[PDB]
Design a protein around this ligand. Structure first.
Ligand SMILES: NC(=O)c1ccc[n+]([C@@H]2O[C@H](COP(=O)([O-])OP(=O)([O-])OC[C@H]3O[C@@H](n4cnc5c(N)[nH+]cnc54)[C@H](O)[C@@H]3O)[C@@H](O)[C@H]2O)c1
Ligand SMILES: NC(=O)c1ccc[n+]([C@@H]2O[C@H](COP(=O)([O-])OP(=O)([O-])OC[C@H]3O[C@@H](n4cnc5c(N)[nH+]cnc54)[C@H](O)[C@@H]3O)[C@@H](O)[C@H]2O)c1
Ligand SMILES: [Zn+2]
Ligand SMILES: [Zn+2]
Ligand SMILES: [Zn+2]
Ligand SMILES: [Zn+2]
Lengths: 374, 374
């Protein structure tokens, strides 16, 4: 039995920004009280993991990244009540402690125990469970899924259906749930509305899925890579536009196309300029714009507050507004009942050992989601 | 009889920015089709009128300003069906055409016929009804209430209760309705919540009234003029704070006071820095911030979009979100039924001839609302 023992396993360590991951042996400590050690089965490559590499999202290095994943519990620390060894689980990059003022609020989900606002790269107790070459290695968002084994706090894991296909449902740990919830929960897209979705990657495609599920009449996809348009239309886009094709700014184009502005817009890229464009293209009196993309570290946008005074609503969210531990198992159950599809997001499959090729695919524009198998 | 004739009457003409109003004779043309000529009874001094004087709010000059008022219909043009001679009325600086996409939307109120976005300073037909010393004089927001008589489009006037005290209910034409609706309709303040209100002038006091009516448990008033605090507490503030008293930025103070951020914040001043402060002091995961203050012309704010990505909602509104022609008569009926008070907003009552003394009271910090009586 490995219970109570250090596990030696392979992980993808990021020693430096703007460098390939290093696949090499790490030591994974056993779980302490209220911790869970997970044998990973599948993990997706999310652009947010690439943001760690590029320095767009600052978190302490060296680090084991990865946050979109599914696995099987290897062991539980003292006092764990919500999972058992052998359970299928999805790590939760947004925890759900159940006790803070956000967890108790009917509409909050950004639990105060998160490691996203001001990342420390540790477990809840301020320490690390990972050693590599004798050196402590940081965690990422309390998940660190680019490893054959990880250790997470109990508030950062959800038990899911024992019959779940882990190589699909790992996407419920980030990209699918984020995009879908941003439409259905955060924006609250209405039947018959017109939506504009900026960025047609895995998260933007999931936004489109949610807009279509909510009954939008028009869903306009916006991307500078026209190779993204075919899949966007397959999952519900009615029109796609490439800003590079137009002489005028795309907010003017979208305002014209929607006969005075869209009902709902979504920024699903991570650029300051497209956050402001996406706000501007929603109707000035009653439009809603949702920021989903992660902005570059410490940079401020500039905007004219008259865009809000006329009546627009501007909001953002983490993880589609879903309370993570309550919602992830329900989303898996709904997937099992065919209430939504995940295959449209999966364009590539690789073994974990080919993680760097998976990041190459994302950076070239060729992939939506690559799923890595351990 | 005056019907069908030019009226020569007294008005307050603003010939150029940053000068006193000139109280002098103007000619007021009779109403054309679908227009209404009103004998003014009372008009309030709103900070937005001072924004015209100061160049904070750009509108064509020379101009008859004034937009918060009540009067009696003198005559109606062909085709008017909603008011008759002798009716008490409130001019609507936000029209309600009933035909545009905003008017048809359940939550929109910023009718596309407004003259606020891109001010032309005319009637709907692109012409003026005012002459002074042989020169055409612009309208202001389709109202122009600093005149013994004005002409408005039918979509810019509402009939109110014949028994209405016009020297009080003129405030339903702007300041009361704007603040009250910003709380009850735009923010949708909840029972038991904590609110922060930046700016304790007539509009901010009306926000406090709305927050109290909605059942807020805590209402924190914020002003650099501590002379505003006593009246803020009278109408429902539980605490007041002056940013000048603190070594820390007031967003940090308010976050500490509210044990992690307020539920609802309101910017009721018109400064870029307080718009960002007000957003920052609402709880990062579920807080709502409403911009009510009018920003200085053409100036952009700077902010970190992580404030929104965590879950905040940022919105603004004109006229408290109220559909103007539907709402103004109901607000007057509610005032007549003692559902809210207006006297706390009224600090001074002067003859119209003292308009410049009324503006000096506002600029000195000494008044909330001055009502001018014709
Ligand atoms: N809020 C959350 O909880 C959360 C969760 C998951 C992802 N994210 C972020 O969401 C964003 C999208 O992630 P993803 O879908 O994995 O990324 P992705 O697959 O890189 O997709 C981004 C898309 O944006 C397109 N694009 C780039 N620049 C422009 C431009 N100027 N105009 C229009 N399109 C452009 C690009 O071609 C690509 O198809 C990233 O910033 C992520 O970090 C946020
Ligand atoms: N959105 C709308 O439809 C609408 C309607 C009416 C008024 N307005 C605007 O709302 C704002 C308030 O109008 P009002 O109540 O008539 O004005 P007001 O009576 O001048 O009140 C403004 C208050 O802000 C206070 N103040 C000034 N600077 C600061 C600061 N740095 N920090 C905190 N307090 C400060 C000031 O002392 C005063 O008590 C103005 O910008 C108006 O133009 C908007
Ligand atoms: Zn929590
Ligand atoms: Zn992600
Ligand atoms: Zn209209
Ligand atoms: Zn006003």
């Amino acid at each position: 039995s490995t219970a109570g023992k250090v596990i030696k396993c392979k992980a993808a360590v990021l020693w430096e920004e703007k460098k390939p991951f290093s696949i090499e042996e790490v030591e994974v400590a056993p779980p302490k009280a209220h911790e869970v050690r997970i044998k990973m089965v599948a993990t997706g490559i999310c652009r947010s993991d690439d943001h760690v590499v590029s320095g767009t999202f600052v978190t302490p290095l060296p680090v084991i990244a990865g946050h979109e994943a599914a696995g099987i519990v290897e062991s539980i620390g003292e006092g764990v009540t919500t999972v058992r060894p052998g359970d299928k689980v999805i790590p939760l990059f947004t925890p759900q402690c159940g006790k803070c003022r956000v967890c108790k609020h009917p509409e909050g989900n950004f639990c105060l125990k998160n490691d996203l606002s001001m990342p420390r790269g540790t477990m809840q107790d301020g320490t690390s469970r990972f050693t590599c070459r004798g050196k402590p290695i940081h965690h990422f968002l309390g998940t660190s899924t680019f490893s054959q084994y990880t250790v997470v706090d109990e508030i950062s894991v959800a038990k899911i259906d024992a019959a779940s296909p882990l190589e699909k449902v790992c996407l419920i740990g980030c990209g699918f749930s984020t995009g879908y919830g941003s439409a259905v929960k955060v924006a609250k897209v209405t039947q018959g509305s017109t939506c504009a979705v900026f960025g047609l990657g895995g998260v933007g495609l999931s936004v489109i899925m949610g807009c279509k599920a909510a009954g939008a009449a028009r869903i306009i996809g916006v991307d500078i890579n026209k190779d993204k348009f075919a899949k966007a239309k397959e999952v519900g886009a009615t029109e796609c536009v490439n800003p590079q094709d137009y002489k005028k700014p795309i907010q003017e184009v979208l305002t014209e196309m929607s006969n005075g502005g869209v009902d709902f817009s979504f920024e699903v890229i991570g650029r300051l300029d497209t956050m402001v464009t996406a706000l501007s293209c929603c109707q000035e009196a009653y439009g809603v714009s949702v920021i989903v993309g992660v902005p570059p570290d410490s940079q401020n946008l500039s905007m004219n507050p008259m865009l809000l005074l006329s009546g627009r609503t501007w909001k953002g969210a983490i993880f589609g507004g879903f309370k993570s531990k309550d919602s992830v198992p329900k989303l898996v159950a709904d997937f099992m009942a065919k209430k939504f599809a995940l295959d449209p997001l999966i364009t590539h499959v690789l073994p974990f050992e080919k993680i760097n090729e998976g990041f190459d695919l994302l950076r070239s524009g060729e992939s939506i989601r690559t799923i890595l198998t351990f």
